[model samples]
Target: GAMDNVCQPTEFISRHNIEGIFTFVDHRCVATVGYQPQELLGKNIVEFCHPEDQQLLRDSFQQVVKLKGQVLSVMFRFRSKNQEWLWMRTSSQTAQNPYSDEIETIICTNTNVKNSSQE
Candidate 1:
């Protein structure tokens, strides 16, 4: 990967395993959805997606892994703790661990969705 920092000021950084379970997330998530990284640990990311958008997001993940972990961008509504559907744009790619060859995690960068402004 040539890019160093995937995070912008309003972009939330998170990492998930092949199974869509969160491996890591930063405090920036709070500014986007109000969930602490700890609160989402071990949780399937689809659990927070809108009911109608869940399947497509999962399908999207399949491609995220299938293409040798290239940058895959997706849009979905993320369920906030307050029960609101916050539409977000997530760009994800598979990141391989240098020490553990088979160990791979998806590096996901989520935009705040406020500025993306899409209908």
Candidate 2:
């Protein structure tokens, strides 16, 4: 018997505290979001957020930037290519940009929590 399946956590990098744009995203992460990497790069993170939760995302990003070395967690829904609302938890932290050696972007990891009751 042979199985062909893979699972991994989704992760991405958003510049300007998740407001400016997505600088990088793992291929698996893009696939999980149902979008090609090209469609996401250079796009504002808020564009994919649920309308009602957009403000919440903004506020969360602000708080994280204000609190140095802080890890901020925000639960919200993101729209998939299929138009399904997938619940996701986005954990963000302030980190030094490896290339620029500056703290100008937010490092974010996304967890699919839609099927979990833990959230």
Candidate 3:
């Protein structure tokens, strides 16, 4: 399971992870909002993604599918509602989704890191 801090969101949209679910529309990525995970289950992941990094995240996600659940590690930034940016280091490996039997789920984890270090 992903850490609550990484899963928890401070802004408007939150994310959730469940097997076989097409979660992007609802914002369910590894990150989410509120103190509890249940509250974040239906939120949108894009709401917190940095405008510049959204495409990067999408690309990485596609790679996981194309590679048939290959493990991946990537870093990207997310824009806060207040307009500040935060960098995240994310790692993911492939697994099957229960909801969409043909689709794969990335068992992903991410953490906020010092943006300067990445630059």
Candidate 4:
């Protein structure tokens, strides 16, 4: 049946979950942190990230930004709704928003590494 194979690996889409000030997250992404999409909208992403990983996360963002619109893959720890840490591999790239005509945000596909240990 189509339903048997329709489900893809769990992947979440996010914007402004990096260093920018904007946008929302998908329900799946919010579910990763045990929150609803509405609860996370317009919020700083670092709040849901592990404190120790924040520095590396910032560094990763800067590295991608330095590439002048190239994509960079980075792994970091994120705090979940139960306060557990989940490992995530995020492929990041800088892009201009057609509506705003500015490159003020980073877009990324955030995937959960199931059963992965946090660093």
Candidate 5:
């Protein structure tokens, strides 16, 4: 009685302002990262990162800022609600905002590189 892969979500999407401030988090996270849709809005993406990974996360954020719509990948540990650090490999891009002249937003496509089961 197996079904297609659409039943559960492993791929996640999050958007941030030029400063990594979360602007949008898709509903897929409602089941995966243990967060309700609105809980992450207005929060800094770095706030969810582990201490050791904050430096790397900042660098990644800056890298995308320099390139418009270019893709770059980075790995970081994001803290879950239960206080668990989940390893996420993310590819991000800096996209220009249609309504703004000097501001842009970063969009991240993320996947879990490690799960809690330790597999």
Candidate 6:
């Protein structure tokens, strides 16, 4: 089955094993609302992710690579095109392709969960 509506620059690159995220999505830009697709495209996905959320993201990414079908519920910062940071709730999972190859895809979204507890 073909993936739809949900992919990040890094995920696309890793899954396809390509050099870079050269193609932009049609009708689907970056899922992050305030950010421009161009800003996130061809950029390191980890850079925009919050430093604190790094470990959680890394572990989840590994599960996807191993075809573990892991699900991660995480809240993290998503940097925008204009250099503003926003909160996002993200998730990911892995599935085997028709060729029996593992392809990791993600379904993620953002909400207004500010860092109120941060000192």
User: lDDT tens string, model 1, 6-74?
Assistant: 232255666776556777766556545656666666777778977788776666667767875666667
Candidate 6 stretches with Cα past 4 Å from truth are 1-33, 36-38, 95-107, 112-119
Candidate 3 — worst ten consecutive residues by lDDT sum? Answer: 11-20
Could you say which candidate leads in lDDT? 1
Candidate 5 TM-score, true structure as reference: 0.71
For 30-60, candidate 2 gives per-residue lDDT tens digits of: 4455544565666666677788987876666
Measured with C-alpha atoms, the lDDT of residue 38 in candidate 3 is 43
TM agreement with the true structure for every prediction = 0.71, 0.66, 0.47, 0.64, 0.71, 0.51
Tens-digit per-residue lDDT, 36-119, candidate 6: 445445544446667787566555656554656664455556554435555554454444454123323232445432442110
Among all windows of 10 consecutive residues in model 4, the one with the lowest summed lDDT is: 99-108
lDDT, residue 54, candidate 5: 66
Q: Tens digits of per-residue lDDT for model 3 on 52-92?
A: 76566555555655675574455556443324455554443
- TM-score, candidate 1, is 0.71
lDDT of each: 0.58, 0.52, 0.38, 0.51, 0.56, 0.41
Which residue segments of model 4 deviate by more than 4 Å? 1-9, 17-22, 99-119
Work out candidate 6's RMSD over C-alphas.
8.9
Preferred candidate (TM-score higher): 5 or 6: 5
lDDT of 2 at 118: 20
Superposed model 5: Cα runs more than 4 Å off:
1-7, 96-119
Candidates' RMSD to native: 7.3, 5.7, 8.0, 6.4, 5.7, 8.9
lDDT of 5 by residue, 13-82 (tens): 6667656566776654444455544766677766887778867776676777676566557777777554
Model 5, position 79: C-alpha lDDT score:
76
Candidate 3: stretches off by over 4 Å: 1-36, 79-84, 96-119
Query: Each model's number of backbone clashes?
Result: 0, 0, 14, 0, 0, 0
